[PDB]
Amino acid sequence: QPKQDLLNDRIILVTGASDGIGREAAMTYARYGATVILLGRNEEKLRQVASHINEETGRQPQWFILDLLTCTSEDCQQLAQRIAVNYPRLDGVLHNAGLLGDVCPMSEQDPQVWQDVMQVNVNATFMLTQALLPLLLKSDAGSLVFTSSSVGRQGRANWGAYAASKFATEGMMQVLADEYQQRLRVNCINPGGTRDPQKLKTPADIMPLYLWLMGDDSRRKTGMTFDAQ
Amino acid sequence: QPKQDLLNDRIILVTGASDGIGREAAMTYARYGATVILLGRNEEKLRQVASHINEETGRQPQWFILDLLTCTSEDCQQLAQRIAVNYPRLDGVLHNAGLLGDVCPMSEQDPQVWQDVMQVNVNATFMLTQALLPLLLKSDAGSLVFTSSSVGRQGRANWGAYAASKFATEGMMQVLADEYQQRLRVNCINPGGTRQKLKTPADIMPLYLWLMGDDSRRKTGMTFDAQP
């Protein structure tokens, strides 16, 4: 599909960058020319992913530490302040950080795990969004992408807090898209089943959508949720 | 529609029972024969609502204190124990408690208010549901009703935490309906704008009555608008 320089001169921040889909997305964005900013809780994990992208790409991403389970609104503003000293805008923010929590009936759901899933997937993702909006408004056409799931649109047995949180994520995305008509592109990606493990798709397999949402080919698309597979 | 003894011998718990829609739902259910249990955060207000329902109906609801803003899972479990001492089952639970929070752009939403809205409307509403499930399963046909909103189906500018929380509520309702198919009726009610060209709580009662009475027995997993 996309040309190899699709994301030249796009600065894109990726949360949950240290492993899984986040790690693939950061690497993929860099491969396609982006200046990537990695966000995660583990500095040694982040440094390792940055080194790999540099070896593979020749340019080394910066990383910043944030723990969504515990971060405050103050921590997010300070993170945004640190970014802004190094970077003039954010062209993209990919919210790929998340907690799955318990997969079990509602009667069995652990209430602290429930609280933790809502804190990471909803509340912290919101506070981080709020902190980063000014930088995103500095883009020619900033793009904000949340991670959803099939159970964010149709609740199913056993999916408890994760489902509740992904519904909330669809709602948050919709409110934002309505507030930022013209000004920001705000959408969700549903990556689907990525991780019978040999039957599933690899993060690499689902990347085209992640690329599309950050490149110019999706320029006036907002308020939608997209299925990666 | 419906007969005046619709809810005779139905035991129905109403949260947020001490004002607005909750207070009207409690009263309506009592008028229609139900044994009502009121839940709220403030004793003085609940007692006043109970007394008024007794005056108007002739039977006095019991009340229990729970503050969804600060309650723990243990608090909900203890509440459920206290209810079980006094009652053999719950035929209905109406989750009417809620916090609206800020109505303003996402960039201006107060993060503390945001967290409080999610804690009341989602976390504590789930924790309370969890504690009351055994009682509801003891009904012949227990009915669990959440409160939603038009902005729990389509997000709109300025509705911030409320919207996120009501999407979460539609999601929680859908998971529960899937888990309890054939065992519990689990649905949402969107009361619409209420409280001069707006409707009163009294005006929107038909749906609240319908979901607790036998006419809705086969209906689960759905979200209903009180004002179509």
Do the Cβ atoms of B126 and A107 come within 8 Å? no
Q: Which residues contact A67 (CB under 8 A, 6 or more apart)?
A: A41
- For residue A106, give the nearest of B157, B159, B176 by CB distance: B176
CB contact under 8 A, A172 and B163: yes
CB contact under 8 A, A155 and B166: no
Resolution (A): 1.8
Does the annotation mark A29 as catalytic? Answer: no
Residue at B39: amino acid letter: L
Q: Does B206 touch chain A (CB under 8 A)?
A: no
Tell me if residue B57 falls in helix, strand or coil: helix
Given CB atoms, is B179 within the 8 Å cutoff of chain A? yes
Amino acid at position B213, single letter: G
| B114 phi, psi to nearest 5 deg | -55, -55
Backbone angles phi, psi at A88, to 5 degrees: -85, -10
The domain B1-228 belongs to what CATH superfamily? NAD(P)-binding Rossmann-like Domain (3.40.50.720)
Pick the CATH number of A1-229 from 3.40.50.720, 3.30.60.50, 3.30.360.10, 3.40.50.1400: 3.40.50.720
For chain A, say whether B114 makes contact (Cβ under 8 Å). Answer: yes
Residues of A in contact with B172 (CB under 8 A): 106, 155, 163-164, 167
Closest CA to B133 of B169, B98, B180, B174: B180
Instruction: Kindly report whether the peptide bond that precedes residue B2 is cis, defined as omega within 30 degrees of 0.
Output: yes
**Measured on CA atoms in the order B177, B181, B185, B191, is the torsion positive or negative?**
positive
The C-alpha atoms of residue B214 and residue B184 are separated, in whole angstroms, by 13
* Chain B contact present for A198, CB below 8 A: no
A104 vs B: CB within 8 A: no
- Contact A152/B164, CB-based, under 8 Å? no
CB contact under 8 A, B127 and A107: no
Report which secondary-structure segment, H or E, holds A143. Answer: strand A142-147
Q: Is A229 on the interface with B (CB under 8 A)?
A: no
- Tell which residue, B52, B40, B162, has the closest CA to residue B96: B40
**Chain A residues within an 8 Å CB radius of B118:** 118, 122-123, 168
Q: Which of B68, B135, B166, B175 to mutate to test the interface with A (most CBs of A within 10 A)?
A: B175
Alpha-carbon distance of B216 to B77, in angstroms, equals 29
* A93 phi, psi to nearest 5 deg: -135, 120
CA-wise closest residue to B152 among B95, B206, B111: B95
Catalytic residue among B29, B32, B162, B208: B162
Name the residue among B109, B130, B167 with its Cβ closest to that of A171. B167
The secondary element (H helix, E strand) that includes residue A142 is strand A142-147
Residue A106: which residues within 8 A CB-CB, separation 6 or more?
A: A160, B126, B129, B130, B133, B172, B175, B176, B179
Q: Is B23 on the interface with A (CB under 8 A)?
A: no
Chain B within 8 Å of A62 (Cβ-Cβ)?
no
For chain A, how long is the longest CA-to-CA vector? 51
Are B175 and A114 within 8 A, CB to CB?
A: no
* CA distances, A139 to each of A88, A107, B98 (Å): 9, 46, 38
From CA A89, how far away is CA A142, in angstroms rounded? 9
Residues 6+ away with beta carbon under 8 Å from A40: A15, A16, A17, A18, A22, A46, A63, A65, A66, A97
Q: What is the DSSP string of B78-144?
A: HHHHHHHHH-S--SEEE---------S-TTT--HHHHHHHHIIIIIIHHHHHHHHHHHHHTSSS-EE
| Cβ-defined contact of B106 to A176 (cutoff 8 Å) | yes
